[PDB]
Amino acid sequence: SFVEDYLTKLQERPTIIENPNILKGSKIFNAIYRVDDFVYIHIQSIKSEDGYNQYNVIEPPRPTHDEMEEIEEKFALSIGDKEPPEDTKEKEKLIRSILDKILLRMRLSVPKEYVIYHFIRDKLYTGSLEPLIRDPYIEDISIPGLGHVYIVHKVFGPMRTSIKFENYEELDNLIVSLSEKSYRPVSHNRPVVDASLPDGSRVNFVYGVDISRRGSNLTVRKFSRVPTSITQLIMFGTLSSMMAAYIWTMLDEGMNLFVCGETASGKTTTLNAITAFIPPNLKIVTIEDTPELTVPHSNWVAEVTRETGGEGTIKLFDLLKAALRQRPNYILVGAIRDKEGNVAFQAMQTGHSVMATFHAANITTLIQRLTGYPIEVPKSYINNLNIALFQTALYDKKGNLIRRVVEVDEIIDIDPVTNDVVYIPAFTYDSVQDKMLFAGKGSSYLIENKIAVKRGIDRRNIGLLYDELQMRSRFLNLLVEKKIFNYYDVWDYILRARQMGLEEAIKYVSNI
Amino acid sequence: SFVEDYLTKLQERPTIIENPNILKGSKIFNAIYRVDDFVYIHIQSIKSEDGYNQYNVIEPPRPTHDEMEEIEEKFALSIGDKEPPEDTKEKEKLIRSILDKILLRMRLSVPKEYVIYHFIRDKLYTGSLEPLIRDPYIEDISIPGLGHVYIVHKVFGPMRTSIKFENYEELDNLIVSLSEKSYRPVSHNRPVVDASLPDGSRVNFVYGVDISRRGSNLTVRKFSRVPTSITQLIMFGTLSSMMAAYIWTMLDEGMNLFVCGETASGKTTTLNAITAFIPPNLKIVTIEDTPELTVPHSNWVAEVTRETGGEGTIKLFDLLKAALRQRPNYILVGAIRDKEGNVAFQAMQTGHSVMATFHAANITTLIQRLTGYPIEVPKSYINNLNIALFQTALYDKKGNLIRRVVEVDEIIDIDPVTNDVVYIPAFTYDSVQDKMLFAGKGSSYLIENKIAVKRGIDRRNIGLLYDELQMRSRFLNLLVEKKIFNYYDVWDYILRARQMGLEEAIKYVSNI
Amino acid sequence: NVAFQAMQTGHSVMATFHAANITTLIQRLTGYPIEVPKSYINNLNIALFQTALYDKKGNLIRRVVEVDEIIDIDPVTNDVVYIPAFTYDSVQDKMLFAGKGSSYLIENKIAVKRGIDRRNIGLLYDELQMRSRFLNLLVEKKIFNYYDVWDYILRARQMGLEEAIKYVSN
Numbered sequence A, B: 001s002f003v004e005d006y007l008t009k010l011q012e013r014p015t016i017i018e019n020p021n022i023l024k025g026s027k028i029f030n031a032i033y034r035v036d037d038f039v040y041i042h043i044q045s046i047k048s049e050d051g052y053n054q055y056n057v058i059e060p061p062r063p064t065h066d067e068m069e070e071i072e073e074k075f076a077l078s079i080g081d082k083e084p085p086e087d088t089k090e091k092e093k094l095i096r097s098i099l100d101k102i103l104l105r106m107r108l109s110v111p112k113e114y115v116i117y118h119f120i121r122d123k124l125y126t127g128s129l130e131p132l133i134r135d136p137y138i139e140d141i142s143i144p145g146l147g148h149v150y151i152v153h154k155v156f157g158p159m160r161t162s163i164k165f166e167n168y169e170e171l172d173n174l175i176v177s178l179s180e181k182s183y184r185p186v187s188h189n190r191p192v193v194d195a196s197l198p199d200g201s202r203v204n205f206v207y208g209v210d211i212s213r214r215g216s217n218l219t220v221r222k223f224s225r226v227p228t229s230i231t232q233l234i235m236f237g238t239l240s241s242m243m244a245a246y247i248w249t250m251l252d253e254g255m256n257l258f259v260c261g262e263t264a265s266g267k268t269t270t271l272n273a274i275t276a277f278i279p280p281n282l283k284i285v286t287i288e289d290t291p292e293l294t295v296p297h298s299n300w301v302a303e304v305t306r307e308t309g310g311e312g313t314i315k316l317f318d319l320l321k322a323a324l325r326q327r328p329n330y331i332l333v334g335a336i337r338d339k340e341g342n343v344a345f346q347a348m349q350t351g352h353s354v355m356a357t358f359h360a361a362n363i364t365t366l367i368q369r370l371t372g373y374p375i376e377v378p379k380s381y382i383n384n385l386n387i388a389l390f391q392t393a394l395y396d397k398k399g400n401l402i403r404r405v406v407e408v409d410e411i412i413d414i415d416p417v418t419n420d421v422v423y424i425p426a427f428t429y430d431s432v433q434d435k436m437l438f439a440g441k442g443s444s445y446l447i448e449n450k451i452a453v454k455r456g457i458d459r460r461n462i463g464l465l466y467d468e469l470q471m472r473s474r475f476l477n478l479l480v481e482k483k484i485f486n487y488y489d490v491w492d493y494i495l496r497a498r499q500m501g502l503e504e505a506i507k508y509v510s511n512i
Numbered sequence C: 001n002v003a004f005q006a007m008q009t010g011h012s013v014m015a016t017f018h019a020a021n022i023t024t025l026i027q028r029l030t031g032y033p034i035e036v037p038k039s040y041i042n043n044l045n046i047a048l049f050q051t052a053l054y055d056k057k058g059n060l061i062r063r064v065v066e067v068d069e070i071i072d073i074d075p076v077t078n079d080v081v082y083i084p085a086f087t088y089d090s091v092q093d094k095m096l097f098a099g100k101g102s103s104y105l106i107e108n109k110i111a112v113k114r115g116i117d118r119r120n121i122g123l124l125y126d127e128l129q130m131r132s133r134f135l136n137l138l139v140e141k142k143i144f145n146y147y148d149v150w151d152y153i154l155r156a157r158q159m160g161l162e163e164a165i166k167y168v169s170n
């Protein structure tokens, strides 16, 4: 068969899996896995001098150019007047039929099925890129110009694929047909185009050698349908169970919270994980430039921006303004860096809860950038933001990149005398022991001065809040210990905890 | 009956109740309350796993799809060239008649009265959302995308209803159809629309999967056709009786006044309330992007902008220019933001009084924005605007949201040494004691340089003006004490005060 | 302005800019039409300055005259704080590592990422010295072609510095 045909020509035969997660940290490998019928992936860890491992795409052989052009011809002549009907799925299963009854009397080189696959892949889908689209372990796809297609793999990082573009014309035809298929055709007049693929991936096209001098280029950004969960983050060591419990307590009470950090620090991942702590019967509105977030709540409005060059442009600013008319309980802003930040604080000021990510290493930098142009949050408004957490990518002792929350700050106010932010570090990070340090039971301005007054608690009864905090930490630990990691499983158990109560939920989980 | 039918399919029967107010606090129940003769609501005390109570709409059964198609097509074939009348009642009268003719000769799968309910519901009203609109216990309605319609119920809080939208295009059609019925169609170019349903409920639309990625979404917020009155605003603490008396005095004398603040600070609400102070026999032209102002005056031109995506588009600017030829006494502009601001001041310079809402937190910012791009009011004309009030949202000590007019400024001049506004703060606010402060006696330039001169009172009998002011404050305080809060009742009492004098008015209303 | 937007969204950036020194650079970055607000200026970490100078025979040479690390904003003056990591001694025609042992980017960015205490910073300066040693060896062996040099840098990435140094030394 086509796989074994490939698989026999290899000097050293690759093993079998179907999930390269096992290889995490394995710097040596030679494996092959399924994607679809007609698509297998052979990953081999060569000692490539420029540090790319190999990602080999295994597809059915192609009929000769002559066969195709003959099949194209005979096909084009059919359904002439006839219009290609709307629906994608039952009107794909039509092009099939027509293929059969023009192939059934043809002497073909390769087996028909394999002819079918290539005809369909190129006509109805993303052609040679389709295996990469179909592969759930790929996050970025780049065709920078002439040469190989490059990807970023979640396990392996950047890899070089076996797919190769040798001429400008192939490249052009790819960018043109895909952009047309995405209903946003490129032209020489407007050669730069952003669009969505049917699977929801985002694609950027740049068309014409006069603009992309190594040949027309594209970039596909794919998004995970299943976000990393809060128990995974705890297991990774990125947050402690107590820290996550603290966040849970705060989101349960509608606190406003920014997840901050600099390049690739994991802000969006942490944001998506802690979203599971927002009470499940509430309305969440997400507003993003890029559709990265997946919210488990049923009452979830998900909005994205649109840039048209002028008329019809919809910005984050516009969507946050509209969110004030949408009765949200939480507004989640993908990332703040412009005037939408001002509207976000006005949303906080008028009874709406907000979370967002922001690119900044520490609270001083965060406040300076929020109060500066272009965001222009007034100092008198900064107090609306209750929690700023900062995380960063660091190396561990083995040289591996890890992500860590390095500080969690409770914002109290800006000092009128000094114009400096008054805040309390709720958590800090000890890099030596690799542990999150909790400031403790007498430490939280938010618990004592905000929540206590909210939940109608007297000072004598303040320990009951710290007690529930402790119980939440216990529950999260038990989830981790029982290996409850999948985002939706974790959501289910959070919901269970809310339904039966923490004390009883802990007993239930203890006995799995 | 359609209801009794429904009950028989149930595992166990719910108790019939007059209204859900009795179920309040409780959580072990099972009830059916009546909305219309066609709408009964079944409420289930057993939560879903995500903590939503279930709100089940009991409607009469629908005709088959082919029956409905047959009816629509026949309805369309009758009358199909003629345009329907604008009057909603006459419209419905016509539709029922025509419908009665078509159905008379038909053999229906369900009773006639049921076909009629559903036809009228979908054609004239809000379709499957109509039961929610008609239930007075519904506060908010959300369709966040594909899935159920979610609501906020006055008794039960968030609930999941039995209404579902499972098809992108059907959801698009709903948003398009409802926006068209709201007199403000969405388009792909302008996919975000704020408007009001025919019943007066505010609605926000977001159109197209390219912007709302889980499907077109909407939010309905119910609330009185009766606008909040000035006596209610005093009782809320948003402004004092003296502040209202001041504004009343100023509008009596044709002063120009902007209501300023951030979004959702309550500016439109305050403008609508103080409009009741404009003398009753005057011409009012309102100019808005969507109607919010409910003017009680008889001589009221209500104009609204229009976006067509091409020819026929009419903006605030165009309407404001036309107002110069319409002999209004007051022009009320819903909000001023762009070059229409310049025309508003042209209106002032040609003898028309103007009020508007504007986005600015203080007088300094207001003047910077008026004089800068794109408004560009020349500096020497800025003092045509007499009064700016600034309103903001805040939290009190308990954490409750409140809205307060925090400053009232009289605009005197722009200082040529150099370009700073000369103004007088006639009122300010003490945020600690939550109190409004008057400047006050012999502080107002407008009282003692415009009104006194017109009157024409000497600088030593100026007490007469401040006595009329203290007088108006007492009358307003009296209305609050006697709980005269309804907008139109307050209007009547104001007109009554005009038509027998303050002294006689205070003394009257003291009795009740 | 968009280059700074790119830094603020987690993309690294390099660029050339026509300016003689950090003061001029910052005036131009913060002024019209670039208009980067001061609070974002320190997204740019390093500014290097290079000039055409005359040699003693009156021919043109190019020299890096300063390398500046951009730190943050001074709370008293509202000015951009920077420290020179390198300066140029025109009389000896030598680059001075003025930031040696006191570089902000080395201690507060690099060292922190590596979890290296303020008291073990010497390890980073050791690694730097080995990098320099390697670059000298390439020069000594007349490895000048851009692609040959690129190959050796990659060889150093692979294999590691110490034995790349051994291989080059031969």
Ligand SMILES: Nc1ncnc2c1ncn2[C@@H]1O[C@H](COP(=O)(O)OP(=O)(O)O)[C@@H](O)[C@H]1O
Pocket (backbone or CB within 6 Å): A233, A236, A238, A261, A262, A263, A264, A265, A266, A267, A268, A269, A270, A357, A402, A403, A404, C010
């Ligand atoms: N806690 C973590 N542990 C390990 N990897 C992570 C963690 N958080 C994020 N990542 C990975 O790091 C990269 C950047 O994550 P992202 O959430 O997009 O960061 P940012 O939002 O700060 O740009 C992604 O590849 C993501 O899968």
Ligand SMILES: Nc1ncnc2c1ncn2[C@@H]1O[C@H](COP(=O)(O)OP(=O)(O)O)[C@@H](O)[C@H]1O
Pocket (backbone or CB within 6 Å): B233, B236, B238, B261, B262, B263, B264, B265, B266, B267, B268, B269, B270, B357, B402, B403
């Ligand atoms: N003084 C007030 N007190 C309490 N609620 C108010 C007040 N003014 C307005 N609101 C409510 O606040 C919300 C925003 O009001 P609106 O007048 O539309 O503000 P803006 O015009 O500034 O956007 C509305 O739901 C309205 O009912």
Ligand SMILES: [Mg+2]
Pocket (backbone or CB within 6 Å): B267, B268, B269, B357
């Ligand atoms: Mg308004």
Ligand SMILES: [Mg+2]
Pocket (backbone or CB within 6 Å): A268, C009, C010
């Ligand atoms: Mg990011």
